[PDB]
Amino acid sequence: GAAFVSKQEGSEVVKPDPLEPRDELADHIGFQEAYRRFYGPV
């Protein structure tokens, strides 16, 4: 579901990066269920 895309959306080609400079960690898959299982209804 949230881990899969369509063939149409995967083929859209038309849609810089330095590795010396050092935050969507909460947008991990299934993050909220685990966070509420560990910390309660926060």
Binding site: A2, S11, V13, E20, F31
Partner: protein, 674 residues
């Protein structure tokens, strides 16, 4: 003995092992070393909650998350979240003890061990300044930095004002010189010399003084690139010699002050500023506290002759002929020599570990190649094949990853593929077969594939000491096209955009054209390609110089049929945005005319109104922004402290209940002053 004053020693001191050992253990004033220790400990204390990730620990290391990690060794695994908080607490205590000089050696080890464990836990967080912090901690572990300006001298006065061996300063100066010189030598690369690495940096307002006498391109080339290279190559030589120390000090101070504002590198610039005074006399703080007014000279510790110590040997013509070099002295000299040799060798040892050699040599973090390469990723496609049925499927790029660095390295890609093969059975996929399709551009250049898209990475062979077979070579024979590419880019309107692509022979590219791009076309520049329309099943061949229009909301395929790589480009214009803008502009003029006589306009005008409030911020005094900055820092510090307290109480006592944890976490996110 002009040499004796130029380098501080003679050529006869380096003729025999005993003479070298005697020279490298000469007593010295430990004041400068103590001041550097204090500053480094303070900076590390302030850096732990921000850059190391203490304030995001509960997000990164949640106990029940599905995540792929990238450690250097696959046998290394993280601990439960509570034990991770304990590790960070021990690291913080070690950093504080290092800063204060209290229980110096134990505090040094307590900082060093968890720090290196955390560093080795994740390869995607490696950079040059974290590696430098680790090296500095390792170096300071073996030094006598608590002989001055410390609380071990307010508790036992026998380690007070005691001398240190010579190699204590020699190793640190060698480390700084090595960093500077190897960075300069790495910047002897064609991309840096020609001015491709940092071509947008000169547009910053901090460079405005230089633009009074020079153009924009000359400012970009002469100042940012050539000036930086010259400074890197000459900083160590200027700082070492006494005649040119002040000028080099001014240059490095300006360089680091400017870099602290141009980039976001954490605390590296301040560490470099604090390390620069290690080249001065070892007694400079004594002179500094002497130069202060006499009204502030009765509260500081009394300035007396430093007492002798056993860590350094004393050689005199009258006070005894000499002493045999003990084990400690030879151990120190050997450590200095071997450590400097290893530090020289390591950035140039890429010819042994060939399994980490991509387009760029080795893993990033320990070669002092800062800001030389820049990457741009255009498209990533991941496709699996079900091993039980045979269906083809497509994954979201980076479902279980917490970073994006895996797109550039074969070892990280192999780790990620193994992760996916393990994790996909939980999502109803049996024995996955995974292929990757990644297009990257480095310092401009045409976009091209970095890996082979026909290879199943799960069974692909990787070895630390073997060259990887499925890594595509970089097409370095098309670099002289960059000027023409820039000309083509600038020769366009402000509504049309271009994408440049180079493809290897034998490979094709399947592309879905979106429905929002009604006016899109492809033009060939080199080689020869065959373009296929999937709906109509039509093959048409393009020769160098001719173009073709492509349909929208359809599929098409580009086959490379030449024996050599072929280059083409995509030209497109987003039609929907055109109509949207040209109706919003008409509506605004209609509003003006109605004055003289829509949710989209609402959103756009709100966004520009808050941007005009940002213009007010520009007019707003800098003290308001400073207050906001201080408040944000205070928030992150308070949150980290409260989370650590919660986890430590859970460890020591036990988890109370879900509701109590919810209340505590709600309190921890209170945003004190907003």
């Amino acid at each position: 003995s002009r040499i004796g004053k130029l380098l501080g020693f003679e050529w006869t001191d380096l003729s025999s092992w005993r003479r070298l050992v005697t020279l490298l253990n000469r007593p010295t004033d430990p004041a400068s070393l103590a001041v550097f220790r204090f500053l480094f400990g303070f900076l590390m204390v302030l850096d732990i909650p921000q850059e190391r990730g203490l304030s995001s620990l509960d997000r990164k290391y949640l106990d029940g998350l599905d995540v792929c990690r990238f450690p250097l060794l696959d046998a290394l695994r993280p601990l439960p979240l509570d034990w991770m908080y304990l590790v960070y607490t021990i690291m913080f205590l070690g950093a504080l003890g290092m800063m204060l000089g209290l229980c110096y050696r134990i505090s040094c080890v307590l900082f060093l061990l968890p720090y290196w464990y955390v560093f080795l836990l994740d390869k995607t967080s490696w950079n040059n300044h974290s590696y430098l912090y680790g090296l500095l901690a390792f170096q300071l572990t073996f030094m006598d930095a608590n002989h001055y300006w410390s609380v071990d001298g307010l508790l036992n006065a026998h380690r007070r004002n005691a001398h240190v061996p010579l190699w204590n300063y020699a190793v640190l100066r060698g480390q700084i010189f090595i960093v500077y010189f190897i960075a300069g030598v790495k910047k002897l690369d064609a991309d840096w010399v020609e001015g491709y690495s940092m071509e947008y940096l000169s547009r910053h307002w901090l460079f405005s003084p230089f633009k009074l006498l020079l153009s924009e391109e000359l400012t970009s080339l002469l100042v940012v690139h050539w000036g930086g290279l010259l400074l890197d190559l000459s900083a160590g030589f200027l700082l070492f010699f006494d005649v040119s120390r002040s000028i080099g000090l001014f240059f490095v101070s300006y360089f680091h002050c400017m870099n602290s504002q141009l980039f976001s590198i954490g605390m590296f610039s301040y560490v470099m500023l604090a390390s620069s005074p290690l080249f001065c006399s070892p007694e400079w703080p004594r002179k500094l506290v002497s130069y202060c007014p006499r009204r502030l000279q009765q509260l500081l510790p009394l300035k007396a002759a430093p007492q002798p110590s056993v860590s350094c040997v004393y050689k005199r013509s009258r006070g005894k002929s000499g002493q045999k070099p003990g084990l400690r002295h030879q151990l120190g000299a050997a450590f200095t020599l071997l450590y400097l040799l290893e530090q020289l060798f390591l950035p140039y040892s890429h010819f042994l570990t060939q399994g980490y050699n991509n387009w760029t040599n080795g893993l990033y973090g320990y070669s002092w190649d800062m800001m030389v390469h820049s990457r741009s990723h255009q498209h990533v496609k991941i496709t699996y094949r079900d091993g039980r049925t045979g269906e083809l499927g497509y994954l979201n790029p980076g479902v279980f990853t917490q970073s994006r660095r895996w797109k550039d390295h074969a070892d990280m890609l192999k780790q990620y593929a193994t992760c996916l093969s393990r994790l996909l059975p939980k999502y109803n996929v049996t024995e996955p077969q995974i292929y990757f399709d990644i297009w990257v551009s480095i310092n401009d250049r045409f976009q091209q594939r970095i890996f082979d898209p026909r290879v199943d990475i799960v069974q692909a062979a990787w070895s630390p000491f073997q060259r990887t077979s499925w890594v595509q070579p970089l097409l370095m024979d098309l670099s002289p096209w960059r000027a023409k590419l820039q000309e083509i880019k600038s020769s366009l309107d402000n509504h049309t955009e271009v994408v440049f692509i180079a493809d290897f022979p034998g490979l094709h590219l399947e592309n879905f054209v979106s429905e929002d791009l009604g006016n899109t076309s492809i033009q060939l520049l080199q080689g020869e390609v065959t373009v296929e329309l999937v709906a109509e099943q039509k093959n048409q061949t393009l020769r160098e110089g001719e173009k073709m229009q492509l349909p929208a909301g359809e599929y098409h395929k580009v086959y490379t049929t030449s024996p050599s790589p072929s280059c083409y480009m995509y030209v497109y214009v987003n039609t929907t945005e055109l109509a949207l803008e040209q109706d919003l502009a008409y509506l605004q003029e209609l509003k003006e005319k109605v004055e003289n006589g829509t949710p989209l306009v609402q959103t756009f005008l709100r966004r520009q109104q808050r941007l005009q409030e940002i213009e007010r911020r520009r007019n707003t005094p800098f003290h308001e922004r400073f207050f906001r900055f201080l408040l944000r820092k205070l928030y992150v510090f308070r949150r980290s402290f409260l989370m650590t307290c919660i986890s430590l109480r859970n460890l020591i006592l036990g988890r109370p209940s879900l509701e109590q944890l919810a209340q505590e976490v709600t309190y921890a996110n209170l945003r004190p002053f907003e």
